[PDB]
Amino acid sequence: LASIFVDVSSVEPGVQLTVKFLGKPIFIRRRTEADIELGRSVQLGQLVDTNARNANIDAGAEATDQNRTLDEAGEWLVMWGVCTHLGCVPIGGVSGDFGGWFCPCHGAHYDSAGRIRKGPAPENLPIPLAKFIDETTIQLG
Numbered sequence: 001l002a003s004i005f006v007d008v009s010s011v012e013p014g015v016q017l018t019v020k021f022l023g024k025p026i027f028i029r030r031r032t033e034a035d036i037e038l039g040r041s042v043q044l045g046q047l048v049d050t051n052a053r054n055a056n057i058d059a060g061a062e063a064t065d066q067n068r069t070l071d072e073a074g075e076w077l078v079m080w081g082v083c084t085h086l087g088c089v090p091i092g093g094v095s096g097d098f099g100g101w102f103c104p105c106h107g108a109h110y111d112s113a114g115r116i117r118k119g120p121a122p123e124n125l126p127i128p129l130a131k132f133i134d135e136t137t138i139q140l141g
């Protein structure tokens with residue numbers, strides 16, 4: 001019975017909701033049109049980590065923008081807010097050099113799809129088991 005159910009009905013574009021799950025933060029960002037476009041503009045060959053790190057799809061899936069969001073429209077980016085270096089909480093609100101998150105502990109930069117682009121972190125921020133169960137609610141777990 002671990003699953004939790006997050007009401008995202010009030011999350012506007014450019015807002016991140018942070019919820020605690022299994023003791024750690026989950027970031028739920030409703031991405032802006034700029035975030036989405038920028039995420040879709042990155043070639044796989046440009047990425048540090050080409051694996052989607054996404055619990056919801058094949059473990060060998062490529063880290064395309066489309067394989068990083070819950071929805072086809074790419075508005076809903078849900079990920080563990082746990083830096084893949086040493087587990088600090090990355091700072092969002094379009095921070096760092098790649099329009100995403102910056103981990104101030106040792107300077108990891110993640111892009112607008114949560115993919116690692118610069119710094120000592122080895123992997124893209126992982127995506128939890130997560131799905132919409134209706135228009136307004138994301139089940140985590």
Ligand code: FES
Nearest residue numbers: 083085086103106
């Ligand atoms: S814990 Fe994030 S860069 Fe080291």
